[PDB]
Every structure is written in structure tokens, then in C-alpha cells.
Amino acid sequence: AGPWADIMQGPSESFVDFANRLIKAVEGSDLPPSCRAPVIIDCFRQKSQPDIQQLIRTAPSTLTTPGEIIKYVLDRQ
Amino acid sequence: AGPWADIMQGPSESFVDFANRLIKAVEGSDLPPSCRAPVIIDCFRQKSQPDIQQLIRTAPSTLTTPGEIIKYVLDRQ
């Protein structure tokens, strides 16, 4: 699919649009299935727009899946 | 350490300098130990300068570790 490691949230892209693009690229990648979720998490933390990076880092340590982080961000927009 | 998913080979950087920076950042990351090598491999394929990306994709399917890919590239420079 798309080169997942190149994906960053662009200035006309919402967080969720970026999350969806990123996840699709990771799912289509050659990565071991068990690495998908931690790579997605790291890319949300590092590759979203800076304001979103700053919101994600306020999330509790108990939020450990991509879906939990997505709900955390969208519920605060 | 450094945000590994942001790392790309810059125009004044050699391939090996980029590989070393990338690997250090991945080693310092929160990634599961078993995901380090496949993430490194993917980042070499996607985040090096375009001419290097094109050289890496000529490598045999038998080269499966970061070190094998590093030797493949450096031995051809």
C-alpha cells in the first residue's frame, strides 16, 4: 500500500483522516502483525500535527490501543 | 531518544549516517524489541534518499537484517 513511514498529518487533513490513511498503510505493510499497533501508536504520537501531538501526550497511560487514542482525540475536539 | 518515525536521510547525510541515527532512535523507542528490526528495514526502504531507496530494492530477498542491507548498500558505493 502507501509507504506508511512517510505519512504525516497535512495542514488540510484532520487527525482522523491522517489516522485512517496511516492505519491503511500499516495494514498493507510487510510488518509482522503484532507490530502494527505499537507502530501505529508511535506514528500518532510523532506524525500528527503538533497541536495533536500535544493533546495525545495528555492521554492516560491506560490508553494503549489506536482506537482508544482516536476516541481520546476526537472526544476532545 | 529521537522520534524515529521523523527520521529521513538529509541531503548532507550519507546513507550510513542516516542508518545509525535511525537505529539509535528505534533502540531508544517504546517499540517491542521484536519489532525493531522490521521497522528499521521498512525505514531504510522508505526514508533513505531516493537513489538509495532504488539501490536497496535491487537487494536479494535473502537479505533480511539491517546489517545485511547496510553492507549491501555500502559495498556498492
Whether the CB of B33 is below 8 Å from some CB of chain A: the reply is: no
Q: Do A4 and B41 form a contact (C-beta atoms < 8 A)?
A: no
Q: Convert B24-53 to b/e letters by CB count within 10 Å (16 or more is b).
A: ebbeebebeeebbbbbbbbbbbbbbbeebe
Whether the CB of A61 is below 8 Å from some CB of chain B: the reply is: no
**Phi/psi at A70 (nearest 5 deg)?**
-60, -50
Question: What domains sit in chain A, N to C, each tagged with a CATH number?
Answer: 1-77 (1.10.1200.30)
DSSP three-state, residue B61: coil
Integer Rg of chain A from CA: 12
Q: Convert A45-71 to b/e letters by CB count within 10 Å (16 or more is b).
A: bbbbbeebeebbeebeeeeeebeebbe
Which method, experimentally, gave rise to this model? X-ray
User: Nearest CA to CA, how far is A3 from chain B (Å)?
Assistant: 6
User: Nearest CA to CA, how far is A75 from chain B (Å)?
Assistant: 25
Euclidean distance between CA atoms A73 and A30, whole angstroms: 28
DSSP three-state, residue B26: helix
| Residues near B7 by beta carbon (within 8 Å), at least 6 away in sequence | B18, B21, B22, B25, B43, B47
